[PDB]
Amino acid sequence: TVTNWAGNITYTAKELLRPHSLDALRALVADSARVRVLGSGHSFNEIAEPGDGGVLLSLAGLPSVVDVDTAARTVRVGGGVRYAELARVVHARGLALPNMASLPHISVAGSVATGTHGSGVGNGSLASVVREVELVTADGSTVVIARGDERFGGAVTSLGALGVVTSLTLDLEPAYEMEQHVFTELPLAGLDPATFETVMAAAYSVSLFTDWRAPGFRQVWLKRRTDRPLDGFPYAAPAAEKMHPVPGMPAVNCTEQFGVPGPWHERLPHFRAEFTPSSGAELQSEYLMPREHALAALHAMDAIRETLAPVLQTCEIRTVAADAQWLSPAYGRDTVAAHFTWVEDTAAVLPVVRRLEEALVPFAARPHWGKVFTVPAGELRALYPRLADFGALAGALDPAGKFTNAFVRGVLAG
Ligand SMILES: *Cc1cc2c(cc1C)nc1c(=O)[nH]c(=O)nc-1n2C[C@H](O)[C@H](O)[C@H](O)COP(=O)(O)OP(=O)(O)OC[C@H]1O[C@@H](n2cnc3c(N)ncnc32)[C@H](O)[C@@H]1O
Ligand SMILES: OC[C@@H](O)[C@H](O)[C@@H](O)CO
Ligand SMILES: [Cl-]
Fold this sequence. Notes:
GO molecular function: D-arabinono-1,4-lactone oxidase activity; FAD binding; L-gulono-1,4-lactone dehydrogenase activity; xylitol oxidase activity
Largest sheet: 9 strands, antiparallel
Pfam families: ALO (PF04030), FAD_binding_4 (PF01565)
Order of helices and strands: EHEEEEHEHEEEEEHEEEEEHHEEHEHHH
Catalytic activity: an alditol + O2 = an aldose + H2O2; xylitol + O2 = D-xylose + H2O2; D-sorbitol + O2 = D-glucose + H2O2
Protein name: Alditol oxidase
Structural class: alpha+beta
Oligomer: monomer
Bound molecules: flavin-adenine dinucleotide, Xylitol, chloride ion
Strand content: 15-25%
Family: Belongs to the oxygen-dependent FAD-linked oxidoreductase family.
């Protein structure tokens, strides 16, 4: 029996395949009628489900390649490699990524497939650093698509619906140091658009957290580059203690605070690489909207906070720079993201998700493809200007829909 990380999704397991060579992988794909790839299982819905008849394919049995070209400042990484390993290797060569997700133990291919991002107003999504993807397509042939190709905008954030991504090449920068400064009790009252932008721009990456109980925000996390200036932060009080994003959880699990300098890859995530949970008692949703709607969205959430709070562990507010990828929730517009880590109870949570989606409809809110959402397919298709172009690319590379399951079919058709 195969489950996702949160344990709310159990897959229909005809067979799980774990090839040990590319030769074996190509033959298995060509010989199978329906395939979905399983990454690290950090999605919260049926996106990785093959359905009956279909095969679930993992890259865990392949050599986990991490090939840093220091001259070119690039790294070539296998489809199943996770960020924690990637980051350690690139750091040891004196290089770095521009951003990371909250927890590093997640597959690179699976991360970019759904629109994974961190925070920072000038920082693009995790997909934005990819310069090339290598795909094993439905007939077992390899197709390489790189920045500049007409098809590239559909090739990185692809919901795994084009084929098996066996390697990706990423752009790198020189290694840098960071400090993390946490603050408590930022009011929502009197926050204007200018002060909101000032707060979110106050360091390289900034997150707000709240429990939607007492008015305002519980915490502000500033992740600052030591090679950039830090101005006084008058808007909230400095934390007296080490904090966890989720009130009442162990702060030992989190990356170092109190402004202590350390390497990028030990400061961008919220959770220490030593923290290796094999499952989590949580559900997640996130909605990504035009940045200009930030204050209006925050006030809509505040007005229904009594509905949100009872089923909420924590809510995180972030920013993302406009993305070139057609299916990125951050496609074509500078973005504000509102993330919800819920309690595990699906029956209690879904009615609240529906209400939240009702409150965010005037703000063109796109849900994160890897998280829980109930936005109807027709509505969903309308939120993505280039969704049609992705549909044509899938039909071209996979005309029999080998890599389409119920989730992808519903999205495209559906
Ligand atoms: C669990 C979790 C999730 C998470 C997070 C922290 C935790 C503990 N922090 C996030 C953050 O800070 N920002 C963000 O935007 N998202 C964050 N998430 C979500 C997570 O990154 C995503 O849901 C991500 O897609 C999970 O990837 P993973 O690889 O674990 O998931 P999967 O269900 O098995 O696969 C997801 C999709 O990708 C396709 N896939 C995977 N590998 C391939 C390859 N090699 N080739 C083609 N497609 C691939 C799957 O088929 C599926 O569609
Ligand atoms: O996108 C997921 C979020 O970043 C969570 O990890 C919160 O930080 C805490 O639940
Ligand atoms: Cl307030």
